[PDB]
Every structure is written in C-alpha cells, then in structure tokens.
Amino acid sequence: ALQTIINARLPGEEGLWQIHLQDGKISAIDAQSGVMPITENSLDAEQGLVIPPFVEPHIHLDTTQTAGQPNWNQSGTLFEGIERWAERKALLTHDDVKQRAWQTLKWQIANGIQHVRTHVDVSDATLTALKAMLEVKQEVAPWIDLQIVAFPQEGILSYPNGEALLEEALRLGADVVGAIPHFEFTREYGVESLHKTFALAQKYDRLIDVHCDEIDDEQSRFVETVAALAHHEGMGARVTASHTTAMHSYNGAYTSRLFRLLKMSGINFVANPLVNIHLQGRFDTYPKRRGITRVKEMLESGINVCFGHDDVFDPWYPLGTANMLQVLHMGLHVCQLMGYGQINDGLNLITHHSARTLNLQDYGIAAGNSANLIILPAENGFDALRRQVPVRYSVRGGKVIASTQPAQTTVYLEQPEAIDYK
Numbered sequence: 148a149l150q151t152i153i154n155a156r157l158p159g160e161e162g163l164w165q166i167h168l169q170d171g172k173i174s175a176i177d178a179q180s181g182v183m184p185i186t187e188n189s190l191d192a193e194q195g196l197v198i199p200p201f202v203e204p205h206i207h208l209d210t211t212q213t214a215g216q217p218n219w220n221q222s223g224t225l226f227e228g229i230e231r232w233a234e235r236k237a238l239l240t241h242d243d244v245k246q247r248a249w250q251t252l253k254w255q256i257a258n259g260i261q262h263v264r265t266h267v268d269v270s271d272a273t274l275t276a277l278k279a280m281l282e283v284k285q286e287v288a289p290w291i292d293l294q295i296v297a298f299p300q301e302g303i304l305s306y307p308n309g310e311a312l313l314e315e316a317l318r319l320g321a322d323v324v325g326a327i328p329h330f331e332f333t334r335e336y337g338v339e340s341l342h343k344t345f346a347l348a349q350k351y352d353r354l355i356d357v358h359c360d361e362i363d364d365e366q367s368r369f370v371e372t373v374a375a376l377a378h379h380e381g382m383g384a385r386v387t388a389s390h391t392t393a394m395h396s397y398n399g400a401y402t403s404r405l406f407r408l409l410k411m412s413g414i415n416f417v418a419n420p421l422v423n424i425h426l427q428g429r430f431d432t433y434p435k436r437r438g439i440t441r442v443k444e445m446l447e448s449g450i451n452v453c454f455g456h457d458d459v460f461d462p463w464y465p466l467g468t469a470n471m472l473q474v475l476h477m478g479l480h481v482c483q484l485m486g487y488g489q490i491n492d493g494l495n496l497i498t499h500h501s502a503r504t505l506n507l508q509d510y511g512i513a514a515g516n517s518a519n520l521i522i523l524p525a526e527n528g529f530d531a532l533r534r535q536v537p538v539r540y541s542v543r544g545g546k547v548i549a550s551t552q553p554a555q556t557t558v559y560l561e562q563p564e565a566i567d568y569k
C-alpha cells in the first residue's frame with residue numbers, strides 16, 4: 148500500500164516534491180526541503196521526473212504483429228499496405244486478434260502507456276476483430292484505458308454495406324466513429340462519408356477520429372469538412388483528424404485560410420511520425436518530401452496536435468517497440484522542432500496533448516486525480532528524450548504496474564568507469 152512518492156522532479160518546477168496518495172488518488176503535492184530517506188509505504192522516484200502516463204492516441208491493434216503475413220509490403224506505400232492487410236484480414240480469427248493485441252498491449256504497459264486509442268477495421272461482414280477488441284478492452288482495463296475506433300478501412304460508401312457495418316460496430320460498443328474519405332472512390336463519396344460519420348456520432352453520442360487526407364495529394368482537403376462539421380455541431384473537443392499528411396503539400400495561402408477554421412473548430416490532430424516518414428514521399432523521386440502534417444505551425448497557433456505510433460510490426464511498418472519517446476524523437480527531427488525549449492516541451496506531445504485528443508477528464512499530476520503516473524530516470528523532458536530513457540515505474544490507481552531496472556554500462560579504461568551518457 149503506497150502512501151507517498153518521494154524525491155520527485157516535476158516539469159517546469161524547482162527542486163524535489165512529495166506526492167501523497169490516498170484511496171488510489173492524489174491527495175496532495177508538497178515541496179521537499181531536500182532528498183528524503185526511503186520509508187515504508189513510500190516509492191522513491193530517485194530524483195526522476197514524474198509525469199502523467201504516456202498516451203497512444205493512434206494504433207492499430209487488430210493488425211499489430213502481422214508484418215509479412217502472408218506477404219510483405221514491397222513498395223512501402225499506404226496503398227499496397229491495404230492490399231496486404233486485405234489478404235491477412237481474410238485469415239483473421241478471434242484468438243489471433245486477441246493474442247496479437249495483448250502482445251502489443253503488454254509492451255505498452257511496460258512503456259508507461261495507460262491510455263490507448265486503437266482503430267479496428269470494420270470493413271468486414273463478420274466484425275471479427277471489432278468484437279474481439281471489445282473483449283480486450285474489458286480485459287486490459289486494470290492497466291490501460293482502451294478506446295476503440297470503428298474504422299471503415301475500405302470506405303463507408305465504397306465498401307459493401309459499409310455504413311451498416313459501421314453503425315453496428317457502434318451499437319456493439321465502439322467508443323469512436325472512424326472514416327477514411329481520401330480512400331473513397333470519389334471526392335463526393337468522401338464528403339458524403341463525413342456527413343454520415345458525424346450523423347452516427349451524434350446518434351450514439353460517440354467521439355470521432357477520421358483517417359484524414361493520408362496521401363501526398365495537394366487536392367485532398369477533407370480536413371476542412373471535418374472541421375466545418377465539428378464547428379456546426381459545437382463538438383470540436385470530441386473530434387480528431389489523424390495524419391492530415393496532405394497538409395504537408397498544401398499551398399500556404401489555402402493553409403492560412405484553413406487554419407482560422409481549424410482554430411475555431413477546436414478539433415484535435417494526430418501526427419504519426421514513424422509511419423509518415425516511411426510511407427509518405429513514396430511517389431517522389433528526388434527531392435523527396437517529408438510528408439508530416441504542419442505540427443510546428445499548429446503548435447504556434449495553439450491548435451492541439453499530438454504524436455501516435457500508428458503501426459507496430461504490421462503491413463504498414465516493419466519496426467517498433469510501442470515506445471512513445473522513440474515516436475517523439477522521430478517527430479522532433481522530421482518536424483524540425485529542435486530548439487532546446489521545443490525538445491524539452493516535447494513530452495507534451497505524448498502526454499497532455501494526447502490526453503486532450505482522447506477527451507480524458509481524469510489525467511494529470513494534481514490533487515483529486517487518480518494516482519496514475521510514471522517516473523522517468525531523467526532530469527527533465529530534454530534529458531528523457533535525448534537519452535531515450537525507459538520508464539522506471541508506472542503507477543496506476545496508486546499501485547505499481549510496471550518497473551524497469553535501468554541498464555548498467557561500464558567502460559574499462561585505466562580503471563572501471565560507469566557511463567550514464569550525461
């Protein structure tokens with residue numbers, strides 16, 4: 148029974164802090180006068196950084212761990228990736244989905260992630276993965292709050308019975324309504340699909356998260372419809388546009404006009420840097436575009452944007468350990484957010500901003516909130532990011548659910564010396 152966390156650093160704060168726990172909540176946060184000694188019922192942060200848990204705002208748990216089955220994505224494009232998935236989706240079973248989803252979820256728990264939004268392909272008359280994932284959500288609840296997006300991978304209007312399947316997924320309990328307007332057969336189907344998505348979200352009172360303009364096409368502007376509909380319904384906080392990689396290729400005048408609406412609408416954005424850098428720019432020769440959405444500009448404008456991993460060893464991405472600091476590292480480089488302050492504040496892109504994207508209410512290190520928090524063996528966000536630190540402890544409801552004993556490196560020169568890379 149933990150009653151206290153001691154010797155903790157907090158972002159943007161001086162010295163050490165003591166975090167008092169009570170009934171699985173944070174009761175108080177008090178400054179320390181110095182390093183406190185270990186005591187029974189206390190957890191020693193060892194002068195590490197305490198932050199709320201990492202969030203994964205965008206992952207595909209139904210496809211995770213399937214790379215190469217039955218074939219590899221040779222071109223490394225979104226479009227072949229969908230072809231490869233269709234082959235694998237025909238082989239999906241209930242147990243298959245749950246086994247693979249849980250494998251990745253365990254990596255996530257180990258990585259201090261306590262909030263996850265997974266998209267699940269509902270372009271499937273049997274709804275096999277969706278129904279399986281609704282079970283996983285209940286099973287993993289003690290460790291991760293999992294949101295499920297009903298994601299119509301092959302289109303709402305462009306797939307047989309797509310709209311009916313999407314609605315059935317909501318009836319069954321999916322938390323979020325998805326869409327994919329740039330993959331619909333026509334621009335008109337794309338726009339109409341968004342009207343249907345918003346209608347369903349209002350009917351069932353659910354969140355929205357659209358796979359939006361994931362394509363190097365300067366004419367793909369479905370994001371403006373997502374934002375306009377959100378604004379009209381007054382529901383911006385409940386709405387997310389994922390990817391928006393087309394925005395990387397927009398002219399600046401249109402982008403300027405668009406940003407006014409994006410800010411007024413209050414919708415959220417997810418960028419997926421590991422996957423975006425891999426899949427975008429594939430139809431360029433040289434020079435080759437980066438293909439990530441306008442993260443730096445969004446931040447400058449106070450538009451909420453955050454980072455997701457998207458894919459973990461699957462048709463779209465052959466790598467990954469579900470690590471959010473690694474995602475952040477890629478995002479900072481590709482988006483050129485490389486100022487000291489920008490790097491130090493980078494933690495926000497995988498914590499607070501992502502919590503806002505998931506519409507979370509019980510999140511943050513504050514008295515009254517659930518005792519959900521993680522401890523990094525690092526002095527601040529910059530240090531954590533530079534050294535790619537593991538999660539020392541993950542605490543949920545005041546209980547430790549994960550811990551990492553950090554690696555220990557020694558060099559043998561004239562005498563043994565410990566190396567910490569600081």
Ligand SMILES: C[C@H](O)COCC(COC[C@@H](C)O)(COC[C@@H](C)O)COC[C@@H](C)O
Pocket residue numbers: 241242243245246247249250253286
């Ligand atoms: C994926 C690999 O690491 C093994 O996990 C087994 C697991 C067992 O199900 C537990 C559930 C509460 O009934 C998940 O383990 C989490 C427990 C220990 O809390 C899921 O296995 C899925 C198969 C059996 O279709």
Ligand SMILES: [Zn+2]
Pocket residue numbers: 241279282
């Ligand atoms: Zn079942």
Ligand SMILES: [Zn+2]
Pocket residue numbers: 422457458463
């Ligand atoms: Zn993806």
Ligand SMILES: [Zn+2]
Pocket residue numbers: 205206207266358457
């Ligand atoms: Zn996705």
